[PDB]
Paper text:
The EphA4 tyrosine kinase cell surface receptor regulates an array of physiological processes and is the only currently known class A Eph receptor that binds both A and B class ephrins with high affinity. Structural analyses, drawing on previously reported Eph receptor structures, show that EphA4 in isolation and in complex with ephrinA2 resembles other class A Eph receptors but on binding ephrinB2 assumes structural hallmarks of the class B Eph receptors.
Most notable are the structural changes that occur to the DEEphA4 and JKEphA4 loops; regions which we identify above as having a high degree of flexibility in unbound EphA4. The structural differences between the two available apo LBD structures of EphA4 and the divergence in conformational changes that occur upon ephrinB2 and ephrinA2 binding are consistent with the EphA4 receptor maintaining a high degree of structural plasticity in its DEEphA4 and JKEphA4 ephrin binding loops. Other EphA receptor structures, including the apo and ephrinA2-bound EphA4 structures, on the other hand, are more distantly related to B class Eph receptors.
Residue numbers in the entry: 27 to 61, 63 to 158, 161 to 209
């Protein structure tokens, strides 16, 4: 049979995510927000008043198993620069998604120049209204392939937006068609 095989689902992760922010403080930060009223983990950054933002957040190593095409589903909120005072010239309404293939599942320092851009990510047609506040929760999906090393790291680069990442899910598609 067919379907999506999940390699990483950030919302299901039990314990620490193990993700690495660069800079360590003042850029991407883990923030728990209280939806029901159950606490849910997000990674947030909002330096929309500041120039020269280059805030990186990378996952830990993700195995590709036997798959060569991988899909990255991101659920996120993103504020309208128009709705924020005093951000003229510095606020952005996109962020960037990157990847880096590696046989090594415990990379320490990874250079910016090892990462390859998948796409610019923006709020678009797919969203739900949910959640205190009502959050506009966007869903964007990109894919990459063919991957050929044991696994890979994903990274999210913020260049001056007001963004909360609520979910990152990485998966591939099976194609075991039925015989008849």
């Amino acid at each position: 049979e067919t379907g999506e095989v999940t390699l990483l689902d950030s919302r299901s992760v039990q314990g620490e995510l193990g993700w690495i922010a660069s800079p360590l403080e003042g850029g991407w930060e883990e923030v728990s927000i209280m939806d029901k009223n159950t606490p849910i983990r997000t990674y947030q950054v909002c330096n929309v008043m500041e120039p020269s933002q280059n805030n990186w957040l990378r996952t830990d190593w993700i195995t590709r198993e036997g798959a060569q095409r991988v899909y990255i589903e991101i659920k996120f909120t993103l504020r309208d620069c128009n709705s924020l005072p005093g951000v003229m010239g510095t606020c952005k309404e996109t962020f960037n998604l990157y990847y880096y293939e590696s046989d090594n599942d415990k990379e320490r320092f990874i250079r910016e120049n090892q990462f390859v851009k998948i796409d610019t990510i923006a709020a678009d047609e797919s969203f739900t209204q949910v959640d205190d506040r009502i959050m506009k929760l966007n869903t964007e999906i990109r894919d990459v392939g063919p991957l050929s090393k044991k696994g890979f790291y994903l990274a999210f680069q913020d260049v001056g937006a007001c963004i909360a990442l609520v979910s990152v899910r990485v998966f591939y598609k099976r194609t075991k068609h039925h015989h008849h």
